[PDB]
Design a protein around this nucleic acid. Structure first.
Lengths: 492, 492, 50
RNA sequence: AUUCUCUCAUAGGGAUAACGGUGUGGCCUUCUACCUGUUAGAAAUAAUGGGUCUUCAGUUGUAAUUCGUUGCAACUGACGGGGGGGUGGUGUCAAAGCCGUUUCAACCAAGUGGUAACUUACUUUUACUUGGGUUUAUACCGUGGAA
RNA sequence: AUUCUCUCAUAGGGAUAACGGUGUGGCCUUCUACCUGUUAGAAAUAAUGGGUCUUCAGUUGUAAUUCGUUGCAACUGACGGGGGGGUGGUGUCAAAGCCGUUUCAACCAAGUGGUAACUUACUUUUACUUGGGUUUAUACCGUGGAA
């Protein structure tokens, strides 16, 4: 087919995606407003509906208007791409620096330009994916972080002490030399058509150095420049794994890991990229616990939310603290916050050994960790009674974790936090003039919360059971050997 | 879905494929019989239709009977796979030794067993393709011979002299140790379910050593055993490319290529495979023409139908001789063979400057080399007037050839052979009593055959033009940079 | 030995033999890799005199 | 109008008012061990209502082997953090320590110079919600029309 | 029966005779520079019939640059093997050589001790045929039924 049919179909799909997202967004907002009213009573605020503020800067940002007039835009763009006159329109770049983080300025392009960028990125990736290295895991459709994690986990067990080099790059996207970039189009066996070359050069006219962020065409150019670095790194004879601008190298020889520094420095001098000397760790020796070392040594390393070691693979401390933050905020929101207002008009007071708020908080925690599964369904999957199960929780993002002790400590932390939150709720209810210290669940003790909640039934469903990380860990371990990583892992 | 639906669908597709092939086969036979009658006149033999002789050995070989009764076979097999009682039936192995070739005994299995083998091979390949090396090109759906050819062609240009090691293995499939094979299922991070282990072991019960040939389940086991060999070969720091049991290694260091021999020997001792000392070439130094060498040296090497060198990539001599064989036989069949019979009853004698046999031979040659394209369509593709063209000829099997001189010599050989065949046809027609030495095309000379045939028209189509390899080479070169290798290459 | 790489390879040989024979080394009575020099000479890594 | 047209087609002109989604219910079919109530009615079966179990490592004693690890009874071992105060053991020449009872803390806090708040929130690889499909049953959410 | 059923389901029982494909034509739509005949009829356009062109490297002289390589006239260089005999050049002190005319060979054969045959053929990575789709137009090919 001609280029105009492809532009028309890509533009139509892109336009319909934003409309679907907006239609789901305002319905979620209405449902959450209704539940907030039922929770806060008469103290709930009013519902507010917002629209993107950049939809009014230029008419072409609005997906409804783009969809209404897509055939003419297609026609025009096609003609100007066949007349060598096309030029992307200036983007909207409101991104600004954030505390403790890089500015990370990101540009948002209009729908026709982003559609052209994605269309021309897909064909280049399809034509040239077979000439990339097997140790690059970013911006591709056949590799993912979990493959690098599995490769490092498998390789580190074999030996007892290995050397490691960790280095970082400063301003990766904004420091690529244009004369360098243009010289790689005729090397390593790549296939770039003249029209594709034109389209690529059309996106760099405004700048004098670096490549734009926020667009899909720069993700191929990001992997294009490191082909010689990966070629020389593999020729050296050391193992490595690179994701975007973050890399790690390990080897058994000091001389080999010293030569890897010279290779990295030579590539940085060739491409004009300067390394950051404040976020780099350098050369260190990783050994098992208790073994002495002659040089600077460490026991574990962090890589993309994981904590690799000689023995086990665990979750990073920052991600653990964010899980604790979300669970604690859910309990505080559903138990303590409503009772701190000026008046209790429209609220509901627990009575007759019933508490809807505790059930709601438990259900929300179960939806946050499991995703809605029950312990009976999990045990049916484990016993082989059933042969189908879905993974849609937070644990789906860390399927390679095999550290039981950390999960046990998280379970004990959850139980203690729940007990103390219920104690504070009881004290606040006593302060308001209601005494419910002899009713469920305020009467339960810490040592019997799980056992007593494991029995209470409602409508034939055990809706009061406390989720455990160990059970879902066992289910993930069983499903990994029967379906694979790609199937088990989350789609995002 | 359950296992029975998958078995039912796979069996049905396999059964319908043979029926489609047979229905196309007997129609091709009838058409060829009609044309043979019109060509040989009254001396043509009678049409004969055959059936596979092994269809009567066991009813289950017949696809019509299998299709008629597929649901019961599905049911049964499923039940016995869920009761741990399944066992493949003995195959039919009529393959025998051939002169100048290995016996290569091949077993044909029945449809349900081959369907189970393919079904269980597909899921294993999907679950474990990400743990294979990037330099293995056999029995996969993401790598092909042409990728290895492009990698060697690109790498050899950079340097002027490299060392090479070429070695071969004797009886690869029939010498794998079972105790070795069973020990690799728990290493390198593989994922094999217990049911899959059962199915695998079910196909090796009869033998005491080696794996069966002719089935789809052994193609995964072929790539499974060489994981440690490829791991150590990549750890050494040398380049290589392995396809099935054939491998090549090249490097810049004598010590590195000497260590590659020790790695190969250690792997052969570990797996029990013995190398053949009569089909191996050893260690040689490849240099450019005219440069002296201190050790045994050569100028080019052969790999999978190609002839690689420092400068160019050409076609192997054996494939060139087979192309010449096919062209010469086509000309002999359509020009000389009919006139050597006892009587010319029912034949047609050329007259009034007309010759249907010459036109038929030219059309068959064009279909053999191009596939039916015309020089006007090719020049339209080259000039950019059109933007779509198909490649369905013999040249589609060698798209990376860039040796113009060889194609020019083949063109001159074609012209000379055509001229001499027409001269012999004229002499035979003179011997039968007809003098046509002053009529087209017997009057044309060698130096004007192309120029005169390039003008004659019939029904507005230049059906007498002589095909040239250089034009299709230019079209292949242009299409490679605009669609890619996967798209241009043949589907087989 | 006189070479750091050679004394680093000796560790891999010892570890491979321990894995082959099933013997496990004790990490509390071992001293590791150290450089022995004469008294008064500086060292770049952990050093001892006797 | 987010619906439909028109062409000079990253724009401009007409014509019609509806056009996209969410919750609940329905239907379609879809992977499931038992034991018991009350119904119905022939135990073909249904209909509903209650309760239990599922994992791993062992030690066996044995069958099977296809010469192994297997399948098995029976067995026994696992399987929900940490911190600050008080008070008994038992620790020894002192002691560490090791035992368990009783209190305090919504979380970061096993800490800060000091400790409260927050989810349409906050941010560097950092994000997702419950087998599908179809329902002019049923109630509502953008934006229009009417007013 | 290769069609449909039935269950004890790698099998066995019934019932119906049609069931799968190929060539040609049709239709649907699908990527295409011109110049000319004769038609038709208004040059809106058709309908058919004839003929030419398409690639790469240069040298420019110049415009554009977005500071380059570009786009351009015009230019000139490419673009269909080898072998065995005869005979002229020109080779030089001889000579190699280098020039081109004239004959012989269906291919392997630029070779074998010797050279004919073969495609439903022969064989180690070794194989495929012409944008699709739909046509109870039209003629035929397996296997059934009828006979």
């Amino acid at each position: 087919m001609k280029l105009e049919q492809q532009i028309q179909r890509v533009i139509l799909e892109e336009a319909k995606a934003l409309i679907k997202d907006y239609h789901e967004y305002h319905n979620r907002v209405h449902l959450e407003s209704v539940r907030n009213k039922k929770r806060l009573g008469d103290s709930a605020p009013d519902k507010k509906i917002h629209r993107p503020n950049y939809w009014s800067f230029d008419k072409k940002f609005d997906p409804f208007y783009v969809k209404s007039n897509y055939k003419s835009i297609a026609r025009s763009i096609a003609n100007k791409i066949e007349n060598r006159t096309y030029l992307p329109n200036e983007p909207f770049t409101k991104d600004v620096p954030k505390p403790d983080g890089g500015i990370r300025k990101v540009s948002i392009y209009q729908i026709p330009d982003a559609a052209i960028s994605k269309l021309f990125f897909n064909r280049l990736l399809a034509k040239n994916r077979h000439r990339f290295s097997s140790f690059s895991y970013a911006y591709r459709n056949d590799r993912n972080v979990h493959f690098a994690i599995q490769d490092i986990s498998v390789d580190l067990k074999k030996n007892e002490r290995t050397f490691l080099a960790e280095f970082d790059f400063s301003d990766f996207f904004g420091s690529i030399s244009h004369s360098f970039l243009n010289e790689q189009f005729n090397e390593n066996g790549f296939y770039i058509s003249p029209e594709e070359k034109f389209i690529i050069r059309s996106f760099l006219r405004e700048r004098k150095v670096g490549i734009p962020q926020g667009t899909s065409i720069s993700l191929f150019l990001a992997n294009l420049t490191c082909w010689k670095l990966d070629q020389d790194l593999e020729r050296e004879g050391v193992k490595f794994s690179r994701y975007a601008d973050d890399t790690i190298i390990w080897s058994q020889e000091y001389s080999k890991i010293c030569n890897a520094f010279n290779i990295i420095t030579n590539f940085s001098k060739s491409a004009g990229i300067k390394i950051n000397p404040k976020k780099s760790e350098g050369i260190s020796l990783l050994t098992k616990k208790g073994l002495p070392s002659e040089i600077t040594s460490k026991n574990n390393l962090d890589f993309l939310g994981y904590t690799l070691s000689v023995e086990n693979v665990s979750i990073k401390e920052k991600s653990v603290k964010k899980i604790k933050k979300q669970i604690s905020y859910i309990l505080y929101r559903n138990l303590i916050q409503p009772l701190k207002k000026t008046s209790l008009a429209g609220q509901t007071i627990p009575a007759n050994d019933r508490d809807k708020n505790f059930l709601i908080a438990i259900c929300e925690i179960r939806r946050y960790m499991y995703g809605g599964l029950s312990k009976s369904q999990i045990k049916d999957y484990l016993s082989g009674r059933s042969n189908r199960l879905y993974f849609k929780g937070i644990m789906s993002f860390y399927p390679l974790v095999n550290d039981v002790e950390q999960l046990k400590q998280l379970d004990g932390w959850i139980v203690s936090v729940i007990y103390r939150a219920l104690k504070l709720r009881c004290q606040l209810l006593s302060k308001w003039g209601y005494n419910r210290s002899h009713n469920f669940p305020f009467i339960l003790d810490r040592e019997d919360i799980v056992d007593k909640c494991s029995k209470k039934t409602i409508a034939g469903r055990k809706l009061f059971e406390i989720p455990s990380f160990l059970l879902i860990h066992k289910a993930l371990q069983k499903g990994l050997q029967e379906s694979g990583i790609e199937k088990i892992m989350n789609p995002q």
